[PDB]
């Protein structure tokens, strides 16, 4: 028993996990979080319907890796161009309306919350919870 957050690959087990978290149905969608520009480099946006879970994925990966961060310093990792017409490129950022309202829709999910030094951080009860979902699905249908 027991699995680690950085042992195996992520796509399919988070597919199952985010499918469960989208079929929960308790998430009443904030109505001012989809019209967001986010970034210019994207010609489109995620349609997984775990899209709020996608900015949550950015927060989760880039705060587990290096703590004490928000959703703007989370990308130093795609350097090169952002050919944006007449002005030069920029470095990634994060919309804070999106963060406010994912925070308002993330109470009770025990994933992440505002830390005590700015940004986001994994909750201890939530950390136990996510290790528990990992282990339980490992024992049940994903890693047995």
């Amino acid at each position: 028993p027991g699995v680690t957050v950085k042992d195996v690959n992520q796509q399919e087990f988070v597919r199952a996990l985010a499918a469960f978290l989208k079929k929960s149905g308790k998430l009443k969608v904030p109505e001012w979080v989809d019209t967001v520009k986010l970034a210019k480099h994207k010609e489109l946006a995620p349609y997984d319907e775990n899209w709020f879970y996608t900015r949550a994925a950015s927060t989760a990966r880039h705060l587990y890796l290096r703590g004490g961060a928000g959703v703007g310093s989370m990308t130093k990792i795609y350097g090169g161009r952002q050919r944006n017409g007449v002005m030069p490129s920029h470095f990634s950022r994060g919309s804070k309306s999106v963060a406010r309202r994912v925070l308002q829709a993330l109470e009770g999910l025990k994933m992440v919350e505002k830390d005590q030094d700015g940004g986001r951080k994994l909750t201890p009860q939530g950390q136990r919870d996510l290790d528990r979902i990992a282990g339980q699905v490992a024992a049940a249908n994903k890693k047995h």
């Binding site: 680690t4 950085k6 042992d7 195996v8 690959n9 796509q11 990792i77």
Partner: protein
């Protein structure tokens, strides 16, 4: 004491703590041909088809694999496994068996022990880069 150089190449590194343990077949902790970038996934399947299942029942290689760059992080796992087999066989039974599997692996491909020395070179006067010069008018 402790002899540990693990694997590295170009920029990336697979820290290979070699000891006794489970030693299951895993790359980045992940299955045999399952890596997400999906480009160079066969390079490890080859040797384990020759010896047998008993040989990897006690070689735990715990790897901290960090580094962006395919030709760096890939081609460093082959270096890491070559050094793992070399150290295991040298310390345990004798260097003749290490001689043999190192012979097959290294004479199989030269480029493990040798990295590319090529690196971006300095920019110079009166030009957009290292060798190019600004257009000369008359």
């Amino acid at each position: 004491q402790s002899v540990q150089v693990f694997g590295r190449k170009k920029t990336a590194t697979a820290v290979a703590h070699c000891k006794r343990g489970n030693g299951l077949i895993k790359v980045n902790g992940r299955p045999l041909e399952m890596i997400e970038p999906r480009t160079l996934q066969y390079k490890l399947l080859e040797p384990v088809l020759l010896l047998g299942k008993e040989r990897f029942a006690g070689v735990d290689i715990r790897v901290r694999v960090k580094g962006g760059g395919h030709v760096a992080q890939i081609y460093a796992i082959r270096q890491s496994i070559s050094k793992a087999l070399v150290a295991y066989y040298q310390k345990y039974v004798d260097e003749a068996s290490k001689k043999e599997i190192k012979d097959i692996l290294i004479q199989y491909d030269r480029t493990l022990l040798v990295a590319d020395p090529r690196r971006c070179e300095s920019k110079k006067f009166g030009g957009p880069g290292a060798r190019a010069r600004y257009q000369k008018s008359y």
